[PDB]
Amino acid sequence: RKSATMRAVKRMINTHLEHKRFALINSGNTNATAGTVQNLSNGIIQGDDINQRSGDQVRIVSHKLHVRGTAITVSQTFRFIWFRDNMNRGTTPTVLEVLNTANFMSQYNPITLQQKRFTILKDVTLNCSLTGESIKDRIINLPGQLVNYNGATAVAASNGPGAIFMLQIGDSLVGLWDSSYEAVYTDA
Amino acid sequence: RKSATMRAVKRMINTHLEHKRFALINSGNTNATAGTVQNLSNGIIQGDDINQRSGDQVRIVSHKLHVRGTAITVSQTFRFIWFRDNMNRGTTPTVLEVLNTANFMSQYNPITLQQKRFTILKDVTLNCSLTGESIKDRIINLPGQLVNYNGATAVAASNGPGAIFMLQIGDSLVGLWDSSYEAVYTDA
Amino acid sequence: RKSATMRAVKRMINTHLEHKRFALINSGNTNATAGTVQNLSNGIIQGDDINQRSGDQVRIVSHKLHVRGTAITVSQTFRFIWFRDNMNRGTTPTVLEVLNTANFMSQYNPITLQQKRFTILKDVTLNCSLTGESIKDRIINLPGQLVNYNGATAVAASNGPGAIFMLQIGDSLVGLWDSSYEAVYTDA
Amino acid sequence: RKSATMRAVKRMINTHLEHKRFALINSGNTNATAGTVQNLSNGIIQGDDINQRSGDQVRIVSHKLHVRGTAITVSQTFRFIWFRDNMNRGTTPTVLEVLNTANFMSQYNPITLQQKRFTILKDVTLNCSLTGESIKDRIINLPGQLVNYNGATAVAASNGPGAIFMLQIGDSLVGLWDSSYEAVYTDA
Amino acid sequence: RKSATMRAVKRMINTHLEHKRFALINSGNTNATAGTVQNLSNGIIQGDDINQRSGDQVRIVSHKLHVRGTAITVSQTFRFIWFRDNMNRGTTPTVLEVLNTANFMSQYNPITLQQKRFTILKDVTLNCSLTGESIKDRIINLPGQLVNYNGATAVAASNGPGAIFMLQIGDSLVGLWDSSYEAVYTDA
Amino acid sequence: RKSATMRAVKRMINTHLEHKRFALINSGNTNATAGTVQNLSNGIIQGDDINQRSGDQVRIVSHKLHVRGTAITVSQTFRFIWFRDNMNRGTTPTVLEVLNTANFMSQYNPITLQQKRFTILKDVTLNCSLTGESIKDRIINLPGQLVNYNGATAVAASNGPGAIFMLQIGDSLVGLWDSSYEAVYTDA
Amino acid sequence: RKSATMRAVKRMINTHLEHKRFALINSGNTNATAGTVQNLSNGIIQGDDINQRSGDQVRIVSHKLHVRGTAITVSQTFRFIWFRDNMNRGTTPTVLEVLNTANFMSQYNPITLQQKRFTILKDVTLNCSLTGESIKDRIINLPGQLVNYNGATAVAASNGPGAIFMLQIGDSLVGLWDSSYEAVYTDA
Amino acid sequence: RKSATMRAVKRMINTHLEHKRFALINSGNTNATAGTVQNLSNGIIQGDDINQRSGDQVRIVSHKLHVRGTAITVSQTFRFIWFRDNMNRGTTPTVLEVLNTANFMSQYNPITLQQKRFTILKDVTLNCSLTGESIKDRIINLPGQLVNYNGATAVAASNGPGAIFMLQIGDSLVGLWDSSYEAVYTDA
Amino acid sequence: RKSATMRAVKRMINTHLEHKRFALINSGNTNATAGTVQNLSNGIIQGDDINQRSGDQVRIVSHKLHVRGTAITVSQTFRFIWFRDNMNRGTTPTVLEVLNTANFMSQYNPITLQQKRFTILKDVTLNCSLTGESIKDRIINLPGQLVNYNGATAVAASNGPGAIFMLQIGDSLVGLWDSSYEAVYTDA
Amino acid sequence: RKSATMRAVKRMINTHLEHKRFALINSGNTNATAGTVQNLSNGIIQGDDINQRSGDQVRIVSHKLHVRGTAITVSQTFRFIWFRDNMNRGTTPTVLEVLNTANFMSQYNPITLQQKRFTILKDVTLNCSLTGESIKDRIINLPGQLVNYNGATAVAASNGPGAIFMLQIGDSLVGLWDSSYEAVYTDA
Ligand SMILES: [Ca+2]
Ligand SMILES: [Ca+2]
Ligand SMILES: [Ca+2]
Ligand SMILES: [Ca+2]
Ligand SMILES: [Ca+2]
Ligand SMILES: [Ca+2]
Ligand SMILES: [Ca+2]
Ligand SMILES: [Ca+2]
Ligand SMILES: [Ca+2]
Ligand SMILES: [Ca+2]
Ligand SMILES: [Ca+2]
Ligand SMILES: [Ca+2]
Ligand SMILES: [Ca+2]
Ligand SMILES: [Ca+2]
């Protein structure tokens, strides 16, 4: 009925927009017991290319995260938290903004999750064993939202509301992890 | 049921376009008896930033003029004419193109208003009194239109059909006026 | 019915997009017995101007080809094949990719036409006679399609799927031909 | 029905207005490689006669262009571009305002055609051959529109929005062309 | 309706069959006053390639003839008779089988056209004038029929019922003519 | 209903065509960090046997990939990318045509995936652990599409639009991988 | 439903009758300023062959005239008048019976056209130029009527009501013309 | 309904046509191991009698074949193949055109039967035994078709499309066979 | 109705496929008391001719057996068993696979007829009497089924599921029998 | 409705038939690189007990296969192919009849799978790892079909159409596998 008419309107809108693609790779990082936060959507900068943007908005159609862990010298845990910062004013968020404590086992920060500063996209835990599977990986594909920006370059000050991030935290410092990201997006 | 569904299609179209914003300030200008014409939409130049444009068209969603006059040494009248040039071929229009005579009390130019060279957005008259209210101001908000451009930079030759202008004219030379403008626009 | 309001949805979509225009002229070329292939849509490069593009996709709304032959020293034939390379990977197609043999009388290449590598837009034959009408010309105007690109500049490696090309081939070497091209397109 | 009732209203209106007529001839002109622009509707001046106007507006009911080409010393091309200047502010448009380059093979000016500064009524190419048909001609009849004026006399400063022009451009300087024009119009 | 559903069944049948293509060229031939008969479909021989066939039947989907004539030393006429031999038993048909007399002006053979031995596909007459247009061409595209074969190779004995031929006849001997032929066919 | 009627029409079409079958095996290959691209559909060559083809088209009904990896001397990753080359013009595609970088973690090439040069059929990642499960395999079965060919033999120049390939890439060089492939197809 | 039933009756009547064919050629005739009248249907004589007749009636199903002119020594006009004599009593009609004067420019004879002695089938005028196209031709195909006869042989006295004729008249004596005629007819 | 009144229309058509009859007897012929082909419908020649024809077409209403074998010196087989040559061009068909080999046991020629050069009316096998029934016979009565002719007399060159023939072939040379034929036909 | 719609779908499928034809003859064979088994469908080998096949499947549309027996020196019986081997794996079946004992009077093999290894097409018994009718024949025509092949050539190892055979068995050794076979088939 | 009461008819039929059960165990077999084929349904021999049969037919209601691999000295792969020979004539099938090559990675035999000689019931791959899970197993339970037999005892010559077999093939020779089988069947 009319709801199918409106979804057809959305599809024919999307046939007139270029679906731009940005890809990213991030390899050879050590497991962090205190945790690190990695930028994902920040690499889309202002310009005229296929992985660049016009203005301070894109609209992510779909976006895909691939994480991979490798246990070195001990069996260990890799935790990856794919999340969206709905309220970013030009920073990279810290670990204690996202987690209640800077421990890999921790639950989320109660205040920032109550006020919906962050939306969790996926919480992935890889347990890599030196006597079992020492290499584990996970690929997650999700539809995206609006991404606002506060600048033109690929710095932390260009992050805006809707910026996509990944937190890595684990129980060791020795093991290694890799990451890759793509985002299909429109820039109308 | 016809305009409502076409209105919803307009909502879905506009939620896919980046609404870009350009702001402008213009302070410390003397009152003009012969009148001057100021540029408003000309400062949207070609580029990739939020206040810039792609190509030679933008479509103003809404735009806002703020005028303010203050009387110096005599009581005087400030007249601000917010207008759109429908037929601009790369100039800034003169005062006698818009007004019948170059006087602050004048009615519009009959020939150019007959052929609809200009559309008057708002005609504002501020009377500033040194024995009463010496400072007056006025803020006007309007929905916009298509703006064509004839160039890439912020010169008069880049003005095209649909360009937004402001005419200031008064009855003294010594009083001061300020203006500020902002336009919300799409660049699809 | 709903098909016509879908048409009105498409028209009001196209109202919000800038219709960018690219123009090109190519004069003073000799008739070729082995044939040459000329680039048409390749001249739309990345940038912010009215004849430039963002990203790697444009959608040609309409595009117009003007070919013109002039007989020199003999009465001769000019053949112009306006075509779309549906599968281009960053080249300019050869004459034997399009035509079964490199002769002006030849039918199309059977394999590349069976696999729909090329869509023929228009095949135009001008017979210019030194005892008759020594100058002939033809203008063809057609609705367009999606054009993909593989690069940012105007080289052969930026041609992509949907690229517009023109093949000239004739029966003499000494006659002259001119061509010109324009493309109305959106770059959303 | 009601649409034909409104059509009968329009016919009853047009039976109460004098249909004025203006004729023009322009013979013995050489072919221009850079191009020239000729005035057509400029010759309706203010006055009380049958080919004159009252005020600054007329409404062209129908208007008819006749062009003719004659090859002298070489076979050549005559290009005639009948067009309406929608945005004229008291000039005769130049060639580069209409055409992208000043060549007879050129496509239109992308900027001025995007902003609809000009509406092309008819584009006519005559190829005249000293070994074939040395004389060619073409007669085009079209319904008209509102023509505004900016003055009273038959000068370029009296041209206004909706003025009718013809651009001649060719590939030689030697051959001769002729023109004639009529306009049937109401002056209510 | 019945025709619509059988048409959809026919499209689903044809999209499951390979549309094979055969191309032919035939240049540099003199005008014949007695007339000659050329083979068109005979070059589809038995084999496994895209321009070959399996068995003794193909079904031509569409096929395309291109004829071209050029006058040498006299103004002359070229006649081309595209025809299908419905009843061929392994020959190339003679001129007097098709035409009532071996003259370029002659009507068809009354007996063989009465018994429907031949079906005329197109009868094309080119008048080439050395004081006017000395080079003429004509391209004809038509849907095809079943073709049977009496052999495997490209000899006249492999021609069968449904074979495609072109008769050329003219009024001079010295002028030249060119031809080329394409056939899109299925081989199920 | 009528959709099931066209479904039964497709059933009766397919029961009148021979379902031909081609099988391939490919063992004893080393893990590649730069990645290699293997041919799958290319082994169907022109001929008259059950695993051969007529002409330059087959229609794959279903086809089946079996990959297998075994870790040697280190725990490692094997990535297999089953993909269809929609736009192949007689090559074997390179790794950087498919992947954004030549690394086993990399996302796809943004340009070639935007223009739909490739369609990914399956992306399979095997992590082989010398302290856990050092041998992994994966069998994928999928319905097929049309395959075009540019030649007759089993060379890369015979690959055409619709050709089937497998990209293998990993994080070590010394581990081994095996593959086998089946394609059920019609050749009508 | 009425006319279609009677139409099917006529078609099934015509399936039971032999469609007899008569062909004719007439070449190498000089252009006549006073005009000549040529016999077309008179060559169907009494007998038993395919181009002969039984009795004094045939019914022409369709019939085809081919005229061709060639300018010699001057550019000249060839006029061919294909016509039916509805009232022939065993003559060949003169030129002044058909035309008002024996001039090539003349209109028809007013008395014989008022009383419908003649029905004009086609009036064809060929202008052949020694500096343009010196050879022109025309083929006309028409359905026929009843032809009565007054005798058995191919003489003028055998012409009857419904006899088919061709008048040639021109403006020179030097140029040459050819003719051919064909008639499909039933003889029940 | 209308189908029966179309049948009545056909019957009243056939009431107005003379049903002409031709009769033929062929006695005293020896059995043939290589086979012979006999003419049946060829004996209807041009003329005015009851067993003759006008033009080149008759329509056989019904036709009747009587074959009769007689064994001499051995028990043997007589095979009679009554058939219609659909594509005859003025010959008598050979035995190898009909039969795959020239043996009495042979199946039909696959190529000429696939292209429908011949329609088999009746295949009749008589086994005559010198210790049993030494004389056998068979009469077959069938409705007929259109017969075209290529000449006026009773020679092989007058056979045309639709001609009726009979093939005798056996396993001995010394036995005798007789045949007789009649054809009821219309000659409208 | 819709069943006739599916029937028309089958007819329109079959008019798009070549009906290929294979013919066989087999003469001069002695009567067998132990019985022999003859190959019928095996002679359709892989190739490109009208009596050859593509791949390993054909679909027999109709096929025709002709048997004939002649008594020598004794009155005797000839039995012919036309049968389809449903389950053939590359052999010629033996007599005891079909018959319960190797005698001309025997009923079928109970096990192989229970499991439907064979389908009997026709069981023909000719009694040839030297004091009566010493020569008998019988022609059987039947619609066909799918035939699979296990090879390419005309050997017993190419016989597959659906192969057609004839078993001959009798009660004497000295009498002679003849056979021939046709198969109309599709090879899509 | 009628489908449910036909189901109830089948259930009340199966209530009156004894559901006979046969069980089988096969332990201690080595992994095979060339592969072996094991008999499953062959052990149901003729007799009167619960695991025996009457006649040559049973109908398997359900049947259950349990395979189990154990890695010895190397990590290896066990492949078990549970299949039904639809066309067995008293053999045990070879490995090359089922698989295209005698390798554990191989796809199926294309010819025998096209002619449906075998139906694959289940293809099972066990990867046993000496550093991981060294013992794997799998139980598959399926509804059965008709089984025909060719003899009374448990030899290969009693296998018939519908016989159940298992193929083991692997990549090592020293690892061990066990299997067990049961079949619930009726013997009416
Ligand atoms: Ca841009
Ligand atoms: Ca944007
Ligand atoms: Ca005060
Ligand atoms: Ca824009
Ligand atoms: Ca774009
Ligand atoms: Ca007026
Ligand atoms: Ca083949
Ligand atoms: Ca074929
Ligand atoms: Ca094919
Ligand atoms: Ca007669
Ligand atoms: Ca008559
Ligand atoms: Ca007749
Ligand atoms: Ca086949
Ligand atoms: Ca039983």
Sorted by sequence, the CB contacts under 8 Å of residue D158 that are 6+ apart come out as D42, D45, D90, D149, D150, D151, D152
Contact indicator for I44, I51 with CB cutoff of 8 Å: yes
Spatial separation of the C-alpha atoms in residues A44 and A149, rounded to whole Å: 10
E73 interfaces chain C, CB cutoff of 8 Å:
no
Task: Tell me which amino acid residue G71 is.
Answer: A
DSSP I157: G
Q: Return the ligand number nearest the Cα of F17.
A: 13
- SS3 call for H114: helix
Residue recorded with tokens 């190397």: J74
User: Quick one: tokens of B37?
Assistant: 């014409």
Quick one: CA torsion of C98, C100, C102, C103, rounded to 10 degrees? Answer: -110
The answer to whether the annotation marks F48 as part of a ligand binding site is yes
H54 interfaces chain E, CB cutoff of 8 Å:
no
Contact indicator for B16, A188 with CB cutoff of 8 Å: yes
The answer to whether the annotation marks I57 as part of a ligand binding site is yes
Spatial separation of the C-alpha atoms in residues E64 and G31, rounded to whole Å: 39
Candidates G88, G160, G165; CA nearest to G122 is G165
How many C/F residue pairs have CB atoms within 8 Å?
Answer: 43
- Its sign, for the CA torsion C2, C6, C7, C9, is positive
From the CA of I147, how many Å to the nearest CA of chain H?
A: 19
Candidates B65, B93, E25, H166; CA nearest to D87 is B93
Contact call for G130 and E131, based on CB within 8 A: yes
- Its sign, for the CA torsion G184, G188, H3, H5, is positive
Give residue D88 CA to ligand 7 midpoint distance, Å.
Answer: 71
Spatial separation of the C-alpha atoms in residues A76 and A94, rounded to whole Å: 23
- SS3 call for F82: strand
Spatial separation of the C-alpha atoms in residues J76 and J31, rounded to whole Å: 9
Contact indicator for G183, G60 with CB cutoff of 8 Å: yes
D59 forms beta bridges with D146, D186
Contact indicator for I185, I20 with CB cutoff of 8 Å: yes
C8 interfaces chain E, CB cutoff of 8 Å:
no
E136 forms beta bridges with E69
* C-alpha distances out from residue A153 to A55, A148, C46, Å: 12, 13, 19
Burial grade of B21 (CB within 10 A; 0-12, 13-18, 19 or more): middle
Contact indicator for C98, C121 with CB cutoff of 8 Å: no
Quick one: CA torsion of A39, A45, A51, A52, rounded to 10 degrees? Answer: 160
- SS3 call for I113: helix
Q: For the residues of I25-49, what is the DSSP string, one character each?
A: EEEEEE--SS-EEEESGGG--BSSS
Contact indicator for C30, A33 with CB cutoff of 8 Å: no
Residue recorded with tokens 């290499």: A135
Candidates D137, D145, D138; CA nearest to D183 is D145
Spatial separation of the C-alpha atoms in residues F96 and F77, rounded to whole Å: 19
Give the largest CA-CA distance in chain A.
Answer: 60
Candidates E175, E141, E172; CA nearest to E66 is E141
Residues in chain C: 188
Residue recorded with tokens 């519908």: J162
G66 forms beta bridges with G139, G180
Give the count of beta carbons closer than 10 Å to the beta carbon of residue G153: 10
User: Quick one: tokens of C148?
Assistant: 């993909």
User: Quick one: tokens of C45?
Assistant: 């490069």
Contact indicator for B186, B44 with CB cutoff of 8 Å: no
Q: Which residue of H has its CA nearest to I28?
A: H105
Spatial separation of the C-alpha atoms in residues G40 and G24, rounded to whole Å: 8
* C-alpha distances out from residue J76 to F74, F77, J79, Å: 17, 18, 10
Give the count of beta carbons closer than 10 Å to the beta carbon of residue A156: 15
Candidates D77, D104, D95; CA nearest to D38 is D95
J105 chain-F contacts, CB cut-off 8 A: 25, 27, 66, 68, 178-180
Give the count of beta carbons closer than 10 Å to the beta carbon of residue I109: 20
Instruction: Give the H/E segment covering residue B126.
Output: strand B118-128
The separation between CA C48 and the C-alpha centre of its own chain, rounded to angstroms, equals 23
Candidates I128, I136, I122, I135; CA nearest to I166 is I122
> How large is the angle between the packed helices B3-14 and C2-16, nearest 10 degrees?
40
> How large is the angle between the packed helices F2-14 and I2-14, nearest 10 degrees?
30
Give residue E13 CA to ligand 11 midpoint distance, Å.
Answer: 50
C9 chain-A contacts, CB cut-off 8 A: 9, 12
Phi then psi dihedrals of residue H49, to 5 deg? -85, 180
Strands (DSSP E) found in D53-162: 57-70, 76-85, 118-128, 135-143, 146-148
- SS3 call for D130: coil
Among the partner residues H2, H48, H59, nearest to G16 by beta-carbon distance: H59
Task: Tell me which amino acid residue D30 is.
Answer: T
Task: Tell me which amino acid residue H120 is.
Answer: I
Give the count of beta carbons closer than 10 Å to the beta carbon of residue E8: 14
Encode chain E in three state secondary structure: CHHHHHHHHHHHHHCCCCEEEEEEEEEEEECCCCCEEEECHHHCCECCCCCCECCCEEEEEEEEEEEEEECCCCCEEEEEEEEEECCCCCCCCCHHHHECCCCCCCCECHHHHHCCCEEEEEEEEEEECCCCCCEEEEEEEEECCEEEECCCCCCHHHECCCEEEEEEEECCCCCEEEEEEEEEEECC
Instruction: Give the H/E segment covering residue F5.
Output: helix F2-14
Contact call for I130 and H127, based on CB within 8 A: no
Sorted by sequence, the CB contacts under 8 Å of residue G6 that are 6+ apart come out as none
Instruction: Give the H/E segment covering residue G186.
Output: strand G176-186
The answer, yes or no, to whether G and B have at least 3 beta-carbon pairs within 8 Å is: no
Contact call for D110 and C19, based on CB within 8 A: no
Phi then psi dihedrals of residue G27, to 5 deg? -115, 165
* C-alpha distances out from residue B41 to B38, B57, B140, Å: 10, 11, 16
Burial grade of H36 (CB within 10 A; 0-12, 13-18, 19 or more): middle
B94 interfaces chain D, CB cutoff of 8 Å:
no
* C-alpha distances out from residue F2 to E5, E9, E10, H142, Å: 9, 12, 15, 44
Experimental approach? cryo-EM
Give the count of beta carbons closer than 10 Å to the beta carbon of residue F109: 22
Contact call for C108 and E68, based on CB within 8 A: no
- SS3 call for A2: helix
Q: Which residue of D has its CA nearest to B163?
A: D115
H80 forms beta bridges with H124, H168
B49 interfaces chain A, CB cutoff of 8 Å:
yes
Candidates H113, E5, E13, E1; CA nearest to I12 is E13
J115 interfaces chain F, CB cutoff of 8 Å:
no
* C-alpha distances out from residue E45 to E76, E150, E180, Å: 36, 11, 18
Q: Return the ligand number nearest the Cα of A19.
A: 5
Task: Tell me which amino acid residue E9 is.
Answer: V
Neighbours of ion ligand 2 (CB under 5 A): A 54-55, 57, 187; B 18
Give the count of beta carbons closer than 10 Å to the beta carbon of residue B25: 10
Spatial separation of the C-alpha atoms in residues J186 and J188, rounded to whole Å: 6
Contact call for C16 and B186, based on CB within 8 A: yes
The separation between CA C1 and the C-alpha centre of its own chain, rounded to angstroms, equals 36
Contact indicator for D185, D147 with CB cutoff of 8 Å: yes
Encode D93-108 in three state secondary structure: CCHHHHECCCCCCCCE
From the CA of C122, how many Å to the nearest CA of chain D?
A: 19
C134 chain-D contacts, CB cut-off 8 A: 75, 129, 131-132
Contact indicator for I178, I28 with CB cutoff of 8 Å: yes
Candidates E105, E101, E142; CA nearest to E120 is E142
Spatial separation of the C-alpha atoms in residues G50 and E109, rounded to whole Å: 11
Q: What angle do CA G124, G125, G129 make, to 5 degrees?
A: 145
Candidates D110, C184, D87, C15; CA nearest to B146 is C15
Encode G23-88 in three state secondary structure: EEEEEEEECCCCCEEEECHHHCCECCCCCCECCCEEEEEEEEEEEEEECCCCCEEEEEEEEEECCC
From the CA of H96, how many Å to the nearest CA of chain I?
A: 13
Candidates D38, D57, D55; CA nearest to D46 is D55
Spatial separation of the C-alpha atoms in residues D42 and D159, rounded to whole Å: 6
Q: Return the ligand number nearest the Cα of H18.
A: 12
Radius of gyration for the alpha carbons in chain E, expressed in angstroms and rounded:
18
Best residue of C50, C59, C184, C186 to probe chain B, by most B CBs closer than 10 Å = C50
The separation between CA A47 and the C-alpha centre of its own chain, rounded to angstroms, equals 22
Spatial separation of the C-alpha atoms in residues E105 and E121, rounded to whole Å: 18
Alpha helices in chain J (DSSP H): 2-16, 95-98, 110-114
Contact call for C152 and A48, based on CB within 8 A: yes
Phi then psi dihedrals of residue H186, to 5 deg? -110, 150
Phi then psi dihedrals of residue E159, to 5 deg? -70, 140
B59 interfaces chain C, CB cutoff of 8 Å:
yes
Q: Return the ligand number nearest the Cα of B48.
A: 1
Q: What angle do CA H108, H110, H112 make, to 5 degrees?
A: 90
Q: For the residues of C55-118, what is the DSSP string, one character each?
A: TTEEEEEEEEEEEEEE--SS-EEEEEEEEEETT-SSS---HHHHBSSSSTTPPBPHHHHHTTSE
Best residue of C56, C146, C185 to probe chain A, by most A CBs closer than 10 Å = C56
Spatial separation of the C-alpha atoms in residues H22 and H39, rounded to whole Å: 13
Spatial separation of the C-alpha atoms in residues A44 and A56, rounded to whole Å: 10
Contact indicator for B171, B77 with CB cutoff of 8 Å: yes
The answer to whether the annotation marks A187 as part of a ligand binding site is yes
Contact call for F188 and E50, based on CB within 8 A: no
Spatial separation of the C-alpha atoms in residues A41 and A151, rounded to whole Å: 13
A16 interfaces chain C, CB cutoff of 8 Å:
yes
Q: For the residues of B54-122, what is the DSSP string, one character each?
A: STTEEEEEEEEEEEEEE--SS-EEEEEEEEEETT-SSSPPPHHHHBSSSSTTPPBPHHHHHTTSEEEEE
Candidates C48, C89, C93, A122; CA nearest to F109 is C89
Contact indicator for J23, J51 with CB cutoff of 8 Å: yes
Residues in chain E: 188
Phi then psi dihedrals of residue E75, to 5 deg? -75, 135
- SS3 call for H11: helix
Sorted by sequence, the CB contacts under 8 Å of residue F18 that are 6+ apart come out as F186, F187, I54, I55, I56, I57, I187, I188, J114
Spatial separation of the C-alpha atoms in residues B178 and F92, rounded to whole Å: 67
DSSP H98: H
Contact indicator for J107, F181 with CB cutoff of 8 Å: yes
Encode C155-181 in three state secondary structure: CHHHECCCEEEEEEEECCCCCEEEEEE
Spatial separation of the C-alpha atoms in residues I36 and I167, rounded to whole Å: 6
Phi-psi region of B35 (alpha: psi -120 to 50; beta: other; left: phi over 0): left
Candidates H88, H98, H102; CA nearest to H148 is H88
The answer to whether the annotation marks B187 as part of a ligand binding site is yes
Contact indicator for G20, H149 with CB cutoff of 8 Å: no
Spatial separation of the C-alpha atoms in residues C163 and C169, rounded to whole Å: 20
Q: What angle do CA I97, I100, I106 make, to 5 degrees?
A: 125
Cβ density class D115-140: b for 16+ within 10 Å, e for less: bebbeebeebbbbbbebbbeebeeee
Residue recorded with tokens 């092989």: H156
Q: Return the ligand number nearest the Cα of G56.
A: 11
Sorted by sequence, the CB contacts under 8 Å of residue E9 that are 6+ apart come out as F6, F9, I9, I12
Half-sphere exposure of F65 (CA within 13 A, CB side): 25
> How large is the angle between the packed helices F2-14 and E2-14, nearest 10 degrees?
40
